[model samples]
Target: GKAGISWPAQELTSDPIAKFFQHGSKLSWHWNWTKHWKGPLVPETSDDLEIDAEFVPMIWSPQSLDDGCDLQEGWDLLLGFNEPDLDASHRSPQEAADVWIQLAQLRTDPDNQHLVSPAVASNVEWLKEFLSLIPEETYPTYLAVHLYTTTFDDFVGKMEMYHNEFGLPIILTEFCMQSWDEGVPGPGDQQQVHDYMGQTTKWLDETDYIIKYCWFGAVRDTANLHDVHPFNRLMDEHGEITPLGFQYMYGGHE
Candidate 1:
């Protein structure tokens, strides 16, 4: 139930990843869009910044399942598709229904693993359609969601709808304020962006349905996030955790 980490698969090296989860870091669990946690890139241990954390996996896309079906012993929770609601083959609810069953079998693992539904990008209709096509018995244990809103109200509004609509515990795998619908990436409100981070996290933690949440940007590189709003990013160019990063890890206004 600690801070969640969005460690994308592209992050081959663990230099920055290690620092984020160093001894005192608040991140206790993370996902890297792959079934296996330890990889050639992920070091077993780092002398200077010792890395110790849990890893979860996500079925990123339809083609991603080629190797996703295997059940690894280290995996505790299985996350569904990564924003399949976007303009991809995964858009159709029927296709998602077909693909989802492949992962259902792994739920049988006696270690108490839970299946989280595919995280929709923005539209609630995509999540709504998929649920209709599937049977109640086949429903995932939790609802996963992603959000990058311009304002705190939009963020709160979406959370309420999702919480009320499904009535299942939520896993906010991706969320942070960014005005993508508008022009540039600068902080529009300037003051509210940082305040939004604090307010949103508090609300999510206080709300009954929210079980887990993650900030959007994990890396120091802007290119990796495709220019996610600078003010909301967690780290700086020199691999140092930014102010927001400190707040996210230590759990206080940094």
Candidate 2:
């Protein structure tokens, strides 16, 4: 029940990884959105920045799991495929269920602890349909969820909604108070995003249904190439922690 990073490999070389665990930050685990242990995306490159946190692996897609891609050197839990419901990489429930049968085999092993379900962009009913396709014994130990919204109330409701809907432990693999439509956060909304960050992290820390939560901003504001708001960045370029970083790392506890 600690804070985790939705790590971008670029940050590995740029920022001081030690600071994330130093004085007040509670972060203990991190994961890049790929199966690569180094966590470099297709567009990114890596050079082995020494790190201290537990590295979780994401299956990302069905194809990423083929061959001997079983448990690596530093992980116990595995995150399932990314937003399958979205058109970006649209996969049918049957398609995903077929893949899960493979992932489920790893979970069925007694030596391992538990693994999570695929993260859906918004349509959780799609997850329900996928669940129905598999046997009950193969069900994931936890449900993975992603949340992006404008209001704090909506965030909490969505969290509770997933809990009520699945009746299983949750791992909030991705969450940010963000805009999904046209030009995001005006000057006025910056304060809202700020408040949202504080309130949600605090709420997530205290909530019992959720097992872990990771934030989106592993990149700095300047090179923020895709997804997530620039203001949500935890570390800035030139190797410095931003104000938001301090808030997220320490939760204002210091």
Candidate 3:
């Protein structure tokens, strides 16, 4: 329930990859309403595994929400929008709040899955505005967020602020060491990411307010346009675990 993976749906069925993920990760999200475009609609879940469905308002339609309502029957958790603050993923706080209220009716229903708020960036002001617009009685079950920084202190401070402000259990769905200034990765970035996760994972596990967390990714690097920091990727060219992936699964300094 706590440990999770943010996986690329393309690699969701790789047996070698699947074995490592099964150890402690009970949950995984593919950052889309459905599975890989070329694969099955849903990944096969065993007794121990669960898949979460995310609704990125930028890409999904109102009819998509109807599809999600049906998809949620198979999913255990519902995650929303991917970084609604940035202009690239640009969804206004008020717009997110509106759709969030509409979709969260799944939770209001008798036995539907739980809902997590739109995964916001570390931008506090943006989050505050979003939360303010949400109606009082209709808050999501968990506050979903994304934090990427060089220091554990920054992570702690941000999480504490969110918990103090909202009084809601948090789901750190996407996090890594992608720096604010240095958008690209260097040679030492992988080691730095591993060490950062080693400390933060322990802290997040013991912290009461944080219900669950997933590393930034679980895929090999590709020629995609989105600036993917190398440190954030958990797997290598052949889908083998990288140093950062090892730290995420088996916490330690290296």
Candidate 4:
């Protein structure tokens, strides 16, 4: 029947069933080839497709996501930060406030720079300046990020990082449980996977930044680097949707 395959659908657009649906609404796709379209690929593309639909792009930030949309104007820097000086720059009120707030942290020892990354940490001030460098433009439509929480202490820094810096209407675009070895690639760890699922679902409910998660993929025993497949649970004895598929539905939503 070619039901789930890609090309057949396009081939069958002339079929009565497909034509009726086409008349009902336009058909859109994901991961399927689109010969040419150059607008920025919004996170919404990811969200709008998958049934879980998180409406946020999991981009690399300060660059592109999934590839293609490399326009640097609209993005959030993943772990990059910079420095600034108030005395010699034309700073807006908002920029001034950001610089001033961060400056106080520098007051104790003016030589120290806020940390962005260990190597880039020393350039925090300059990074802050970089944030202010973009033309006075509205930030991008989607705020993107991912979180991997192993223990309570993990979220502490994560929350601070998101708030202190990219505080905007956002989405925790990627999040998952650590496998047995913290998703480090070993044997199957049902306990770790279960724990991860429970915690992730709870966090999704508690945090507004997260709207959806497409789950990594339905990989196999050794398919993924860590051998942890988010939807591996769905594969039946015959590799079709099983009761495990219901788990994602009931567990993820309910």
> C-alpha displacement of 225 in model 2, angstroms?
5.3
How displaced is residue 212 in candidate 3, in Å?
0.3
The Cα local distance difference test for each model comes to: 0.73, 0.73, 0.61, 0.32
Runs off by more than 4 Å, candidate 4: 1-130, 152-157, 179-188, 220-245, 251-254
lDDT: which is higher, 2 or 3?
2
TM-score of 2: 0.84
Better of 1 and 3 by TM-score: 1
Give the lDDT of residue 177 in candidate 3.
70
For each candidate in turn, the TM-score is: 0.86, 0.84, 0.74, 0.42
Q: 17-46 in candidate 2: lDDT tens per residue?
A: 556767546677777776544433422334
Task: Candidate 1: list runs displaced more than 4 Å.
Answer: 40-50, 68-72, 183-186, 189-191, 252-254
Error of 3 at 87 (Å): 1.8
- Model 3, span 77-175: residue lDDT tens: 666666667662577788778877776675545264666676665566777788789897766677877776768897798778788987789888677
Estimate the TM-score for candidate 3: 0.74
Give lDDT: candidate 3, residue 73: 35
